[PDB]
Design an enzyme around this catalytic site. Structure first.
Site, PDB file in Angstrom:
ATOM      1  N   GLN A   1     -12.565  18.354 -40.190  1.00  0.00           N
ATOM      2  CA  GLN A   1     -11.140  18.630 -39.868  1.00  0.00           C
ATOM      3  C   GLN A   1     -10.229  17.524 -39.372  1.00  0.00           C
ATOM      4  O   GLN A   1      -9.793  17.281 -38.123  1.00  0.00           O
ATOM      5  CB  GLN A   1     -11.422  19.492 -38.484  1.00  0.00           C
TER       6      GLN A   1
ATOM      7  N   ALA B   1       0.800  -1.113  -0.066  1.00  0.00           N
ATOM      8  CA  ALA B   1       0.146  -0.037   0.043  1.00  0.00           C
ATOM      9  C   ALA B   1       0.821   1.466  -0.007  1.00  0.00           C
ATOM     10  O   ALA B   1       2.066   1.127   0.052  1.00  0.00           O
ATOM     11  CB  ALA B   1      -0.995   0.125   1.257  1.00  0.00           C
TER      12      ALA B   1
ATOM     13  N   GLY C   1     -23.856  41.242 -77.192  1.00  0.00           N
ATOM     14  CA  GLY C   1     -23.243  40.742 -78.568  1.00  0.00           C
ATOM     15  C   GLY C   1     -24.259  40.421 -79.272  1.00  0.00           C
ATOM     16  O   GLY C   1     -23.990  39.694 -80.198  1.00  0.00           O
TER      17      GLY C   1
ATOM     18  N   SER D   1       4.399   2.111   1.887  1.00  0.00           N
ATOM     19  CA  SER D   1       5.064   0.849   2.259  1.00  0.00           C
ATOM     20  C   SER D   1       6.270   0.805   1.452  1.00  0.00           C
ATOM     21  O   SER D   1       7.242  -0.143   1.771  1.00  0.00           O
ATOM     22  CB  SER D   1       4.413  -0.453   1.991  1.00  0.00           C
TER      23      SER D   1
ATOM     24  N   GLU E   1       1.158  -1.720 -10.461  1.00  0.00           N
ATOM     25  CA  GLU E   1      -0.395  -1.213 -10.507  1.00  0.00           C
ATOM     26  C   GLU E   1      -1.106  -2.208 -11.585  1.00  0.00           C
ATOM     27  O   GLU E   1      -2.061  -1.621 -12.246  1.00  0.00           O
ATOM     28  CB  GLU E   1      -0.912   0.244 -10.919  1.00  0.00           C
TER      29      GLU E   1
HETATM   30  N1  LIG Z   1      -0.738  14.589 -40.354  1.00  0.00           N
HETATM   31  C1  LIG Z   1      -0.888  15.712 -39.633  1.00  0.00           C
HETATM   32  N2  LIG Z   1      -0.284  16.178 -38.698  1.00  0.00           N
HETATM   33  C2  LIG Z   1      -0.358  17.055 -37.843  1.00  0.00           C
HETATM   34  N3  LIG Z   1      -1.316  18.083 -38.195  1.00  0.00           N
HETATM   35  C3  LIG Z   1      -2.314  17.684 -39.127  1.00  0.00           C
HETATM   36  C4  LIG Z   1      -1.980  16.525 -39.877  1.00  0.00           C
HETATM   37  N4  LIG Z   1      -3.080  16.668 -40.696  1.00  0.00           N
HETATM   38  C5  LIG Z   1      -3.805  17.579 -40.462  1.00  0.00           C
HETATM   39  N5  LIG Z   1      -3.354  18.492 -39.747  1.00  0.00           N
HETATM   40  C6  LIG Z   1      -3.809  19.665 -39.028  1.00  0.00           C
HETATM   41  O1  LIG Z   1      -5.266  19.528 -39.205  1.00  0.00           O
HETATM   42  C7  LIG Z   1      -5.905  20.860 -39.511  1.00  0.00           C
HETATM   43  C8  LIG Z   1      -6.987  20.762 -40.478  1.00  0.00           C
HETATM   44  O2  LIG Z   1      -6.226  19.862 -41.763  1.00  0.00           O
HETATM   45  P1  LIG Z   1      -7.294  19.713 -43.050  1.00  0.00           P
HETATM   46  O3  LIG Z   1      -7.817  20.775 -43.725  1.00  0.00           O
HETATM   47  O4  LIG Z   1      -6.493  18.490 -43.671  1.00  0.00           O
HETATM   48  O5  LIG Z   1      -8.728  18.703 -42.525  1.00  0.00           O
HETATM   49  P2  LIG Z   1     -10.076  18.669 -43.246  1.00  0.00           P
HETATM   50  O6  LIG Z   1     -10.710  17.544 -42.754  1.00  0.00           O
HETATM   51  O7  LIG Z   1      -9.692  18.938 -44.597  1.00  0.00           O
HETATM   52  O8  LIG Z   1     -10.773  20.031 -42.843  1.00  0.00           O
HETATM   53  P3  LIG Z   1     -12.098  20.302 -43.390  1.00  0.00           P
HETATM   54  O9  LIG Z   1     -13.118  19.234 -43.260  1.00  0.00           O
HETATM   55  O10 LIG Z   1     -12.795  21.521 -42.814  1.00  0.00           O
HETATM   56  O11 LIG Z   1     -11.599  20.748 -45.056  1.00  0.00           O
HETATM   57  C9  LIG Z   1      -4.717  21.759 -40.282  1.00  0.00           C
HETATM   58  O12 LIG Z   1      -4.570  22.988 -39.792  1.00  0.00           O
HETATM   59  C10 LIG Z   1      -3.229  20.946 -39.779  1.00  0.00           C
HETATM   60  O13 LIG Z   1      -2.483  21.622 -39.245  1.00  0.00           O
HETATM   61  N1  LIG Z   2     -18.677  38.078 -79.870  1.00  0.00           N
HETATM   62  C1  LIG Z   2     -18.163  38.932 -79.069  1.00  0.00           C
HETATM   63  N2  LIG Z   2     -17.226  38.608 -78.250  1.00  0.00           N
HETATM   64  C2  LIG Z   2     -16.802  39.589 -77.328  1.00  0.00           C
HETATM   65  N3  LIG Z   2     -17.377  40.736 -77.311  1.00  0.00           N
HETATM   66  C3  LIG Z   2     -18.398  41.201 -77.907  1.00  0.00           C
HETATM   67  C4  LIG Z   2     -18.774  40.170 -78.686  1.00  0.00           C
HETATM   68  N4  LIG Z   2     -19.824  40.868 -79.300  1.00  0.00           N
HETATM   69  C5  LIG Z   2     -19.950  42.204 -79.025  1.00  0.00           C
HETATM   70  N5  LIG Z   2     -18.975  42.204 -77.953  1.00  0.00           N
HETATM   71  C6  LIG Z   2     -18.779  43.451 -77.257  1.00  0.00           C
HETATM   72  O1  LIG Z   2     -20.088  44.152 -76.808  1.00  0.00           O
HETATM   73  C7  LIG Z   2     -20.227  45.214 -77.000  1.00  0.00           C
HETATM   74  C8  LIG Z   2     -21.593  45.598 -77.653  1.00  0.00           C
HETATM   75  O2  LIG Z   2     -21.903  45.061 -78.835  1.00  0.00           O
HETATM   76  P1  LIG Z   2     -23.056  44.665 -79.509  1.00  0.00           P
HETATM   77  O3  LIG Z   2     -22.982  46.078 -80.249  1.00  0.00           O
HETATM   78  O4  LIG Z   2     -23.053  43.317 -80.388  1.00  0.00           O
HETATM   79  O5  LIG Z   2     -24.177  44.769 -78.319  1.00  0.00           O
HETATM   80  P2  LIG Z   2     -25.711  44.853 -78.802  1.00  0.00           P
HETATM   81  O6  LIG Z   2     -26.189  43.418 -78.743  1.00  0.00           O
HETATM   82  O7  LIG Z   2     -25.933  45.686 -80.077  1.00  0.00           O
HETATM   83  O8  LIG Z   2     -26.318  45.788 -77.454  1.00  0.00           O
HETATM   84  P3  LIG Z   2     -27.337  47.028 -77.827  1.00  0.00           P
HETATM   85  O9  LIG Z   2     -28.546  46.498 -78.799  1.00  0.00           O
HETATM   86  O10 LIG Z   2     -27.813  47.540 -76.535  1.00  0.00           O
HETATM   87  O11 LIG Z   2     -26.328  47.869 -78.437  1.00  0.00           O
HETATM   88  C9  LIG Z   2     -19.152  45.938 -78.006  1.00  0.00           C
HETATM   89  O12 LIG Z   2     -18.153  47.114 -77.371  1.00  0.00           O
HETATM   90  C10 LIG Z   2     -18.166  44.758 -78.055  1.00  0.00           C
HETATM   91  O13 LIG Z   2     -16.717  44.921 -77.789  1.00  0.00           O
END
Ligand SMILES: Nc1ncnc2c1ncn2[C@@H]1O[C@H](COP(=O)(O)OP(=O)(O)OP(=O)(O)O)[C@@H](O)[C@H]1O
Ligand SMILES: Nc1ncnc2c1ncn2[C@@H]1O[C@H](COP(=O)(O)OP(=O)(O)OP(=O)(O)O)[C@@H](O)[C@H]1O
Ligand SMILES: [Mg+2]
Ligand SMILES: [Mg+2]
Length: 861
Positions: free
Chosen positions: A380, A67, A667, A70, A180
């Site tokens: 996490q 104990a 457009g 002891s 223990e």
């Molecule tokens: N192997 C590891 N050793 C030590 N720490 C770890 C390890 N893996 C993850 N962690 C810690 O756990 C935290 C969360 O990691 P993680 O984002 O991968 O988890 P998660 O499941 O993706 O989270 P969530 O589900 O929110 O996306 C991190 O900040 C990281 O520091």
């Molecule tokens: N195919 C496309 N790709 C990228 N940008 C585009 C294209 N067609 C038009 N745009 C851009 O959109 C702008 C307006 O074009 P557009 O005149 O065709 O519009 P809209 O349909 O006539 O509208 P609104 O009738 O109000 O004038 C132009 O400044 C042009 O740079």
């Protein structure tokens, strides 16, 4: 009876000058494992001989009860230290175990005899089960050693055969001191099996046990009372406890002063003694004697065989689990010249194998079959971290030309830290929906490409392709082994259901063509039954439920709840995920600074072509990139789709009409000029003519050709141009008795086809709409040469779906485009409700292929 020093009983004059050579001298057969523990009544020292009965006395194993107060703790120190001062580590090793946080063996670490000091097990309770296997493994290890070495039967036979005249490694007897054990068995009662096995094997295996407890109850010694030869009874708590370990209640009546106790063995009388001490000083006519002794003995003798290894607390790093990494020539920062470089194997963490008394690195074979990786775990738990290690691990053993990574970060946005890696090509967050679809579309296209090309070339497997590019004489696709990473699969199959079946088929046939999926989620149940089975390599962590596990339900429950990185290896073992670092720091709080330095190291070590980026829909698509009239034919390209970035055509020989909706400045007018210009380049004025309705006058740029017939900038001029073309197309109407051949050939009439180009239809669809008379001709527009090309604003378009002109155009399934708008107008065309889109972009709706997101081309001037 005062208290005596252990140095006195061991005949040591000068404690401060111990010679390990003259302490560990070969002892006689009787004096082996026999040390004094104190003095008896007469004054003679009392020795404890833990040898088997057949060799010395007092049997192999024994029990000690005492104990609080002891001196049970002090007795155990004295016994161990005495044995240490009389035997070399070559012939004796210790396993010191305390169930509760006792500092009994505090300071024993220095001794070469001590293989392990396992303290405080009442807290981390599962460690008991580990300690079981760690010792159970030692029993088997020692046995197989005796089966292998020769075919011996006991350590004694082995030992002196060895010392007789033989070459054998020293195999020391093992002394196990478990304090223990009573409140240990009342915690994990299944542990008693280990005790029984020791009493059955320990004698031959050279394993000696000493069970010590503060207090005992008779039930605890079930099947153990026989194997426990010697019994040391200090001052017990009750009379019965003194009885169950001695046969008499005499230990109850022992003085409160520590040190007093009895010693019973077999049928021979009790021997009351008084234990010596080691936790005191020595005098002459500060520091304890314990410290003085250990200080001199520490560092001498063979280091012991590790029975107990550090139980998975601090995680390893990637440089810790890998050979020295160096910036190689045209191979990047990698294990230069290593056999296992570019073998598609990746190290992830550290697996604990306590039974085998070791801890293995965890390695994955993504070289086929198990090429698909799945990860599960509750909130996490450490997923997002796991993925980053696997990517980095592969990045360390492979060049960016050998592996590529394309990520869908749906679990924290942590993957964005690896975006600067030369191995990655895209990292899409949840807010970038456009890049998410394309990331999947890009890989889908590569799969289809490799599906055809591999059969065209002499490529039988992905292994061959890897071997071809390895020669550095083959280009192939420009890709190597592509990895599609999804952080939260659940998020994917909710916000992007379409991509669930998409990525699923990628997995269903991608491994044979070097396309891997690396998917992660919360629960395995979140993966559909169809795709969950495709994940060959499953990396399971701590789940929100121990069931639903893919390894063992039971084991899964034993995985630490709030210890991130812990998991369950496919074989059914606990492991700890390493950290994606090459610095060496194993601290999770400085992980961010660590990862950034690793990526920096790999990128700067690689001076070649990086991972191919995910190409996306252009913000502006030049009309010049569209196929020429000499390429497409009568078909008119208007842009490219998101699906495969291939041209989208309009063929007015199949479907006569076209309709486009879109808000202000999206457009519309540009698309109208694009389509018009396409008609000019593909038709002669005797083949097709044009009539424009452009109130806003936006179409001047394309109304100058000879095809031009009528141009209207007013309601009056508009309806005037409707009257004469109505009667015109009415003349082309089919006679009743036409043969089917005459109908499909359009023989009964000659001349050009008419393209009615209408811009800003919402401004021409007033109460008195000029286009209204033509509504009855639109169904018959195929038998005649009529074509309707209409653009309308977004406002009130939904209710305009019931207007005679538009309602019939939509009814006859004309090709359409829905650009930028809002959902208030509801479904206009196809199966997608309008929303805010960038300029030029819209949803192309065709009877075949259905709804499709495309990008229209921009035409200057
Ligand atoms: N192997 C590891 N050793 C030590 N720490 C770890 C390890 N893996 C993850 N962690 C810690 O756990 C935290 C969360 O990691 P993680 O984002 O991968 O988890 P998660 O499941 O993706 O989270 P969530 O589900 O929110 O996306 C991190 O900040 C990281 O520091
Ligand atoms: N195919 C496309 N790709 C990228 N940008 C585009 C294209 N067609 C038009 N745009 C851009 O959109 C702008 C307006 O074009 P557009 O005149 O065709 O519009 P809209 O349909 O006539 O509208 P609104 O009738 O109000 O004038 C132009 O400044 C042009 O740079
Ligand atoms: Mg996450
Ligand atoms: Mg316009």
């Amino acid at each position: 009876s005062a208290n005596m020093t252990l140095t006195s009983l061991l005949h040591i004059d000068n404690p401060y000058n111990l010679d390990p050579a003259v302490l560990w001298r070969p002892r006689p057969q009787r004096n082996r494992l026999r040390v004094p523990i104190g003095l008896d009544a007469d004054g003679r020292p009392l020795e404890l001989d833990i040898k088997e009965s057949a060799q010395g006395g007092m049997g192999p194993h024994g029990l000690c009860i005492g104990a609080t107060g002891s001196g049970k703790s002090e007795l155990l120190r004295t016994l161990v230290l005495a044995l240490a001062m009389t035997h070399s580590p070559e012939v004796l090793n210790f396993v010191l175990v305390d169930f509760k946080g006792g500092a009994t063996f505090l300071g024993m670490e220095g001794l070469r005899h001590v293989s392990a000091i396992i303290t405080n097990l009442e807290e981390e309770l599962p460690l008991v089960d580990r300690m079981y296997d760690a010792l159970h493994g030692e029993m088997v290890r020692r046995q197989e050693h005796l089966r292998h070495s020769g075919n011996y039967a006991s350590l004694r036979d082995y030992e002196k055969a060895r010392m007789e005249g033989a070459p054998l490694p020293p195999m020391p007897t093992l002394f196990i001191v478990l304090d223990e054990f009573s409140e240990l068995l009342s915690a994990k009662p299944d542990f008693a099996e280990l005790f029984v096995m020791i009493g059955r094997l320990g004698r031959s295996l050279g394993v000696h046990l000493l069970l010590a407890s503060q207090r005992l109850e008779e039930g605890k010694l079930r099947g153990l009372d026989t194997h426990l030869s010697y019994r040391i009874g200090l001052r017990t708590f009750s009379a019965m406890e003194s009885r169950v370990v001695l046969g008499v209640p005499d230990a109850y009546e022992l003085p409160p002063s520590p040190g007093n106790g009895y010693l019973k063995f077999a049928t021979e009388p009790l021997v009351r003694f008084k234990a010596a001490y080691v936790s005191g000083p020595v005098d002459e006519e500060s520091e304890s004697l314990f410290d003085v002794v250990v200080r001199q003995l520490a560092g001498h003798g063979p280091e012991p065989h590790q029975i107990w290894l550090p139980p998975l607390d601090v995680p390893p790093t990637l440089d810790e689990l890998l050979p020295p990494l160096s910036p190689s020539a045209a191979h990047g920062y990698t294990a230069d010249g290593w056999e296992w470089r570019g073998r598609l194997h990746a190290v992830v963490g550290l697996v604990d194998r306590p039974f085998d008394q070791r801890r293995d690195p965890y390695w994955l074979d993504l070289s086929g079959g198990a090429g698909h990786v799945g990860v599960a775990g509750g909130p996490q738990t450490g997923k997002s971290t796991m993925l980053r290690t696997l990517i980095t691990s592969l990045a360390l053993l492979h060049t960016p030309q050998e592996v590529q990574f394309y990520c869908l970060d749906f679990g924290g946005g942590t993957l964005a830290g690896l975006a600067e890696l030369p191995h990655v090509g895209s990292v899409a967050t949840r807010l970038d929906a456009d890049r998410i679809r394309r990331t999947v579309a890009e890989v889908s296209a590569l799969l289809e490409q490799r599906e055809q090309e591999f059969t065209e070339r002499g490529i039988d497997s992905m292994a061959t392709y890897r071997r071809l590019r390895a020669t550095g004489e083959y280009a192939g696709d420009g890709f190597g082994d592509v990895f599609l990473v999804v952080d939260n699969w659940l998020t994917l199959r909710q916000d992007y259901e379409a991509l669930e079946d998409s990525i699923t088929q990628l997995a269903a046939r991608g491994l044979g063509y070097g396309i891997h999926v690396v998917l992660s989620s919360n629960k395995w149940s979140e993966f559909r039954t169809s795709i969950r089975d495709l994940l060959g390599t499953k990396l399971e962590l701590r789940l929100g439920d121990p069931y639903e596990s893919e390894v063992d339900r039971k084991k899964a429950a034993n995985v630490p709840e709030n210890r991130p990185g812990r998991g369950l290896t496919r074989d059914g073992y606990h492991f700890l995920t390493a950290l994606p670092r090459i610095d060496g720091d194993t601290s999770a709080e400085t992980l961010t600074e660590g990862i950034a330095t690793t990526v920096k190291t790999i990128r700067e070590a690689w001076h070649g072509p990086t991972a191919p980026p995910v190409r996306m829909l252009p913000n502006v698509l030049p009309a010049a990139q569209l196929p020429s009239a000499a390429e497409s034919g009568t078909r008119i390209p208007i842009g490219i789709d998101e699906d495969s970035l291939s041209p989208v055509y309009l063929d007015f020989n199949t479907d006569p009409h076209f309709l486009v909706f879109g808000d202000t400045e999206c457009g519309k007018s540009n698309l109208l000029r694009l389509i018009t210009a396409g008609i000019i380049e593909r038709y002669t004025p005797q083949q097709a003519r044009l009539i424009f309705i452009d109130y806003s006058r936006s179409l001047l740029d394309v109304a100058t050709t000879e095809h031009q017939i009528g141009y209207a900038a007013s309601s009056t001029a508009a309806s005037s141009l409707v009257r004469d073309i109505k009667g015109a197309m009415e003349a082309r109407l089919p006679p009743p008795d036409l043969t089917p051949e005459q109908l499909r050939s359009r023989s009964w009439w000659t001349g050009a086809e008419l393209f009615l180009v209408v811009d800003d239809y919402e401004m021409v669809a007033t109460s008195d709409n000029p286009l209204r008379p033509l509504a009855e001709l639109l169904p018959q527009a195929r038998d005649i040469g009529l074509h309707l090309i209409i653009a309308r604003s977004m406002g009130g378009a939904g209710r305009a779906l019931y207007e005679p002109i538009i309602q019939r155009i939509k009814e006859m399934a004309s090709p359409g485009l829905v650009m930028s708008g809002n959902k208030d107008e509801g479904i206009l065309l196809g199966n997608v409700k309008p929303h805010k889109l960038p300029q030029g972009r819209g949803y192309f709706v065709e009877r075949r292929s259905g709804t499709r997101l495309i990008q229209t081309a921009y035409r200057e001037s």
